[PDB]
Amino acid sequence: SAFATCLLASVGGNSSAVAFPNQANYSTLVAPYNFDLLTTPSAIVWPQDTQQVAAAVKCAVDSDIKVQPKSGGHNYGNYGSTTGELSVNLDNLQHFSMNETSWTARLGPGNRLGRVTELMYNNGGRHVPHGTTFTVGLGGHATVGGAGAASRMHGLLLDYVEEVEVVLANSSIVRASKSHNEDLFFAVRGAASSVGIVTDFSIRTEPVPVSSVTYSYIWEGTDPAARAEVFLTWQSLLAGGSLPQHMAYDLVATANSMILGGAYFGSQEDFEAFNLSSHFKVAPDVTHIKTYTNFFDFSAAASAQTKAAGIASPSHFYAKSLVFNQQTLIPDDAAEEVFKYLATTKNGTDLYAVTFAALGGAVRDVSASETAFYHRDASYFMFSFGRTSGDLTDTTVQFLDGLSEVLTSGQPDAYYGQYVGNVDPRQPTDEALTGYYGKNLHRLQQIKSAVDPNDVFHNQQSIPPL
Ligand SMILES: *Cc1cc2c(cc1C)nc1c(=O)[nH]c(=O)nc-1n2C[C@H](O)[C@H](O)[C@H](O)COP(=O)(O)OP(=O)(O)OC[C@H]1O[C@@H](n2cnc3c(N)ncnc32)[C@H](O)[C@@H]1O
Ligand SMILES: *[C@@H]1O[C@H](CO)[C@@H](O[C@@H]2O[C@H](CO)[C@@H](O[C@H]3O[C@H](CO[C@H]4O[C@H](CO)[C@@H](O)[C@H](O)[C@@H]4O)[C@@H](O)[C@H](O)[C@@H]3O)[C@H](O)[C@H]2NC(C)=O)[C@H](O)[C@H]1NC(C)=O
Ligand SMILES: *[C@@H]1O[C@H](CO)[C@@H](O[C@@H]2O[C@H](CO)[C@@H](O)[C@H](O)[C@H]2NC(C)=O)[C@H](O)[C@H]1NC(C)=O
Ligand SMILES: *[C@@H]1O[C@H](CO)[C@@H](O[C@@H]2O[C@H](CO)[C@@H](O)[C@H](O)[C@H]2NC(C)=O)[C@H](O)[C@H]1NC(C)=O
Ligand SMILES: *[C@@H]1O[C@H](CO)[C@@H](O)[C@H](O)[C@H]1NC(C)=O
Ligand SMILES: *[C@@H]1O[C@H](CO)[C@@H](O)[C@H](O)[C@H]1NC(C)=O
């Protein structure tokens, strides 16, 4: 086809840097993360640099094909491999350099977070707040938000993004920053996937913490009332404002445990002195506290823990998200109903996790309207994850759907955000857009119309032009 010819030329005739349906191994090359929502892109291309990205986009445009990039491939709907669209695989764009005058790093989108973490540490003992899973790609992560262990302390990853290079739908290459193409910069910091392909990032850094203390307190058992009590305490201690601003603080419910976990940036002695578990009516069954003098080790261990938990690998699953704030905190009775629901509902899973992850702190230092990330006044995220041994069934979809309903049952008609970093393809696109972007939606549609009127950069739940 013209498309195939064009697209081979976009990578300089390197036939290893393009793949088409009907090539051997195509479904493996697509590399699904979610194993249920398998896709067949019209082609996959592996550009070497920005120019080849721009060339490949043009090939799609010339053949009336739409485009998504793929960096780490962690999208929960495999949207970076959308069916019938060009998948621009950015695995080759993994450059890294450190400006030691400012400790600002310049990095390609194909860097996965484990490499980002290693290279920032090695280049002068630096880091930036980001997520905990090492296989997440920077390209899709810095462009949605990027919340992790250091976020209460320092904010989102995208709060450290100072400049980007972006390939636009017409194959123009631009830069964006707070001082230049400010509108594009707004959209890239939380909604890049709808407006262009980020081919380079300049990211400010912080010195690593001197001391990083991981904690984990576990309550074992299946009693819904006991579990609700742990949740309610967890929620009220967060809402009360007594927690140290810098400390990561999360609660994970599984079928047989509640795990209060996080990170404290200070001495183990000072952490232990704070006596976090004393606020709970029932003492945890297990406490694990570990100090890391090396921040790379801390980060590697955090990544290894989520992988070991079974919730961080390509798999069959469904997953949903919600944002809660001081105005939508879950009432006592609804929390009781949440844990009753988890206790008795037929779930179809081989594993589930319901994660409550505190935000606040430095995340709130930036206003909702300053970047495309809307949820700045959030108290916490709720992420639900239901893994299955074989193909997903409606049992598990209904399970998570009904869970979101009971979680919001204290105030069913209030606004609830969703994190666009954890896409939920099994809902109306209208509800998704409203959840993902909130009142930033209108401005994003304006920018979409400005930079991509023909909707080249499209997925199931992308921002539509006006
Ligand atoms: C899989 C996963 C995700 C995850 C997580 C744990 C796991 C196991 N833990 C997270 C956490 O602790 N904190 C957080 O903030 N997010 C966490 N996530 C979610 C992760 O941030 C998102 O899934 C993120 O978007 C993944 O990025 P990645 O780069 O790996 O994924 P992708 O499928 O290739 O892309 C996602 C979407 O963004 C678009 N994209 C990709 N690259 C670009 C560039 N360069 N420019 C513009 N858009 C880009 C894709 O097209 C897709 O729509
Ligand atoms: C609500 O969700 C619960 C959580 O998923 C459901 O329980 C789960 O039920 C499945 C199916 O019965 C069960 O499957 C696994 O059980 C064996 C033991 O677990 C192994 O898991 C690790 C890997 O994760 C494995 O490497 C270890 O050897 C470990 O022993 C497995 O051998 C088997 O192949 C299968 O994977 C889950 O264990 C079970 N989870 C728990 C912790 O209970 C529950 O059924 C559901 N309830 C309702 C009402 O629907
Ligand atoms: C031809 O294209 C392929 C794909 O881009 C290139 O192979 C990759 O090379 C990198 C090293 O630069 C390896 O780490 C990857 O595993 C390869 N990616 C694949 C196979 O998808 C190859 O270098 C290119 N040849 C050139 C540029 O002459
Ligand atoms: C390709 O599209 C971009 C984005 O619409 C165009 O850039 C804009 O051009 C208008 C009018 O000149 C400016 O007001 C905007 O500030 C530009 N936006 C950017 C750069 O983000 C660009 O001109 C188009 N290129 C071609 C050759 O048509
Ligand atoms: C496809 O993958 C298999 C297994 O990984 C490999 O042995 C084979 O050489 C691949 N085929 C092609 C045409 O690359
Ligand atoms: C923490 O609080 C509990 C009471 O809930 C108390 O028994 C324990 O001694 C305290 N631990 C400290 C401060 O080391």
d(CA 219, CA 256): 9
For residues 40 and 84, the answer to whether their CB atoms sit within 8 Å is: yes
Paired with 351 in beta bridges are: 387
Q: Which of 438, 444, 439, 450 is nearest to 463 (CA)?
A: 444
Paired with 171 in beta bridges are: none
Which H/E stretch holds residue 306? Answer: helix 295-309
For residues 47 and 56, the answer to whether their CB atoms sit within 8 Å is: yes
Helix (H, G, I), strand (E, B) or coil at 41: coil
Q: What is the dihedral of CA 298, 113, 432, 31, to 10 degrees?
A: -120
> Does the CB atom of residue 184 touch ligand 4 within 6 A?
yes
> Does the CB atom of residue 351 touch ligand 2 within 6 A?
yes
How far does residue 93's CA lie from ligand 3's centre (Å)?
A: 11
> Which ligand is nearest the CA of 175, by number?
4
For residues 117 and 127, the answer to whether their CB atoms sit within 8 Å is: yes
For residues 108 and 96, the answer to whether their CB atoms sit within 8 Å is: yes
Q: Which of 435, 442, 439, 371 is nearest to 191 (CA)?
A: 371
d(CA 52, CA 29): 19
Paired with 67 in beta bridges are: 86, 457
The helix-helix angle for 113-122 and 295-309 (nearest 10°) equals: 170
How far does residue 109's CA lie from ligand 5's centre (Å)?
A: 27
Is there a common fold for 2-89 and 96-208? no
* Other residues' Cβ atoms within 10 Å of the Cβ of residue 157: 27
Structure tokens at 388: 């299955």
d(CA 185, CA 373): 12
Beta strand ranges found along 327-379 (DSSP E): 351-358
How far does residue 344's CA lie from ligand 2's centre (Å)?
A: 15
CATH architecture, domain defined by 212-439? 3-Layer(aba) Sandwich (3.40)
For residues 79 and 37, the answer to whether their CB atoms sit within 8 Å is: no
210 Cβ contact partners less than 8 Å away, ≥ 6 residues apart: 293
State the amino acid at position 360 in one-letter form.
G
73 Cβ contact partners less than 8 Å away, ≥ 6 residues apart: 31, 33, 80, 81, 137
> Does the CB atom of residue 16 touch ligand 5 within 6 A?
no
How far does residue 25's CA lie from ligand 5's centre (Å)?
A: 6
Structure letter (DSSP) for residue 462: P
Which H/E stretch holds residue 446? Answer: helix 441-451
307 Cβ contact partners less than 8 Å away, ≥ 6 residues apart: 133, 313
Q: Buried b vs exposed e over 189-205: b needs ≥16 C-beta within 10 Å?
A: bbbbbbbbbbbbbbbeb
Q: Alpha carbon 434 to chain centroid distance?
A: 17
For residues 166 and 173, the answer to whether their CB atoms sit within 8 Å is: yes
> Does the CB atom of residue 309 touch ligand 2 within 6 A?
no
**Atom of ligand 6 minimally distant from the CA of 273:** 13
Residue of 25, 29, 30, 44 to test ligand 5 pocket, by largest number of atoms within 8 Å of CB: 25
Q: Buried b vs exposed e over 374-405: b needs ≥16 C-beta within 10 Å?
A: bbbbbbbbbbbbbbbeeebeeebbebbbebbe
How far does residue 260's CA lie from ligand 6's centre (Å)?
A: 17
Paired with 220 in beta bridges are: 257
How far does residue 333's CA lie from ligand 2's centre (Å)?
A: 29
Instruction: Write a three-state SS string for 197-217.
Output: EEEEEEEECEECCCCEEEEEE
d(CA 374, CA 168): 23
Q: Which of 406, 435, 403 is nearest to 421 (CA)?
A: 435
Please identify which residue in the block is written with the tokens 């984990």. 216
* Residue 56 backbone phi and psi in degrees, to 5: -70, -35
The domain ranges of the chain are 2-89, 96-208, 212-439
Beta strand ranges found along 330-435 (DSSP E): 351-358, 380-388
Structure tokens at 229: 């009590």
Q: Which of 275, 147, 257 is nearest to 215 (CA)?
A: 275
* Residue 66 backbone phi and psi in degrees, to 5: -90, 175
> Does the CB atom of residue 122 touch ligand 3 within 6 A?
no
For residues 202 and 104, the answer to whether their CB atoms sit within 8 Å is: yes
- CA-nearest residue for atom 3, ligand 4, is 451
155 sits in the region (left: phi over 0; alpha: psi -120 to 50; else beta) called left
Q: Alpha carbon 239 to chain centroid distance?
A: 24
DSSP, residue by residue, 140-171:
HHTTT----TTHHHH--GGGGEEEEEEE-TTS
d(CA 361, CA 149): 12
d(CA 340, CA 114): 38
> Which ligand is nearest the CA of 70, by number?
1
294 Cβ contact partners less than 8 Å away, ≥ 6 residues apart: none
* Other residues' Cβ atoms within 10 Å of the Cβ of residue 172: 12
Q: Alpha carbon 26 to chain centroid distance?
A: 26
Q: Which of 79, 67, 105, 76 is nearest to 197 (CA)?
A: 67
Beta strand ranges found along 316-379 (DSSP E): 316-324, 351-358
Report CA-CA distances (Å) from 107 to 72, 116, 291, 295, 375: 14, 8, 30, 20, 26
Structural method? X-ray
> Does the CB atom of residue 278 touch ligand 6 within 6 A?
yes
How far does residue 24's CA lie from ligand 5's centre (Å)?
A: 7
Q: Which of 381, 383, 254, 258 is nearest to 318 (CA)?
A: 383
Structure letter (DSSP) for residue 135: T
* Residue 340 backbone phi and psi in degrees, to 5: -60, -45
Beta strand ranges found along 351-414 (DSSP E): 351-358, 380-388
d(CA 163, CA 175): 7
242 Cβ contact partners less than 8 Å away, ≥ 6 residues apart: none
* CATH match for 96-208 among 3.30.460.40, 3.40.50.2300, 3.30.465.10, 3.90.700.10: 3.30.465.10
* Other residues' Cβ atoms within 10 Å of the Cβ of residue 222: 12
* End-to-end CA, the chain: 33
* Other residues' Cβ atoms within 10 Å of the Cβ of residue 429: 12
- CA-nearest residue for atom 13, ligand 2, is 350
d(CA 331, CA 29): 47
d(CA 368, CA 365): 10
Paired with 288 in beta bridges are: 216
For residues 92 and 46, the answer to whether their CB atoms sit within 8 Å is: yes
How far does residue 130's CA lie from ligand 1's centre (Å)?
A: 11
The helix-helix angle for 182-191 and 441-451 (nearest 10°) equals: 120
For residues 111 and 157, the answer to whether their CB atoms sit within 8 Å is: no
CATH architecture, domain defined by 2-89? 2-Layer Sandwich (3.30)
